[PDB]
Amino acid sequence: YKIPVEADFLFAYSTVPGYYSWRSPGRGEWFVQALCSILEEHGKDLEIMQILTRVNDRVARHFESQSDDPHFHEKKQIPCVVSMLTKELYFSQ
Amino acid sequence: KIPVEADFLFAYSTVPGYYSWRSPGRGEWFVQALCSILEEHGKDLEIMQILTRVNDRVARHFESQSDDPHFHEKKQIPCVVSMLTKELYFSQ
């Protein structure tokens, strides 16, 4: 009744491989803002993938970079969830 | 404006760096499990629930047999990479 040594990990990355990760001037990282905002609203009632999927959408939609350098102007980001989980994860009940 | 990399999902039969197994005579473990779950639940569970059940079925139900100790009694875990922005049900 063996378990794989790599099982039951989940990696929630702020951005996909090869890509930049953004922060809005003054405040902090886009992925963090979103994560905190969804966890505050739903961390105790949604499954971890629902939460992170909502985080994916929030980062994808709500945010877009501004900059006086055209090379960095109006860019976008998408986070990336890697799941090796074997069950659903709720933080409660 | 939408990110060009958004709304992809990759369901890999195994994690990076690892081998992927097939039982003698009856095809790949990940495929067996994926088909078995989709046939039972493909129309009532979200894609991540499905693939998570696939992860569990591969992790538990299967274990290799072999006369070479180096290949004997091994295990596998699949790996889901999601850039999805919504929940995906195959219906309605």
Add this chain to the structure above:
Amino acid sequence: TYQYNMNFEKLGKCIIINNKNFDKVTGMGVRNGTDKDAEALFKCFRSLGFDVIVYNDCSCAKMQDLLKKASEEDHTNAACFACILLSHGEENVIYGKDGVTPIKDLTAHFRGDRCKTLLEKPKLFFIQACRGTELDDGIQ
């Protein structure tokens, strides 16, 4: 609000690449059982509603061409797109019958900027392949 819109004429296309036999040049053995896998997957995916097509023993150029072409179709009346790859693989690459091609190259055709009629729609890739030669010994 939280789910992908499935109200489209078609669920979408599912391409299955079923690579069984490999050129001796590559050093890879026949993948027995893969026709049985492809058949079972064809049924499940058809059953979900995908317009499934199965391509067998594709070269690297064939695999790239298939996905490029699929990316160039009009998916306006499709909810989503799926591709299933059955083959030998190593990390980040998959075998055609004649060698290896990067998985990212096959998927890049569907990126937002390059396949506008799947914008905001799920693009699913199911990938059955080795990804290197580590063996999970398990525990307990």
Add this chain to the structure above:
Amino acid sequence: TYQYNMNFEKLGKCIIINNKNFDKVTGMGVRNGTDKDAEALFKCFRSLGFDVIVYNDCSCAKMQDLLKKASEEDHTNAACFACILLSHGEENVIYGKDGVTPIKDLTAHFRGDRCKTLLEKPKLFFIQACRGTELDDGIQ
């Protein structure tokens, strides 16, 4: 039956690594805003039930050591484990104050065979770092 068992004396430990300042020889600048992020994350995760600990400006040896040590504690009465990394990064690696260490080497300490008291329990890693140079230009 389909969810992870949460009936444990505690939710578990949440380690936060908040790297803001870097040795000049690394070529990396100060990460402004990261204190605000670490604070907000510490509150969310405390609110969920985690025992949160926040480390700040860690060297590479420190990050490895504290995760190794965490992995060697007794998690028998914890449901899960979480680690949140806030730092600069490049593909597959994360910065300490004095250089770069492979993400996989940090997480490996928690593998099944090496951290038995987290077997069958979720090991969560939230990773906020650059992962290369590319910019998504967007579309539509």
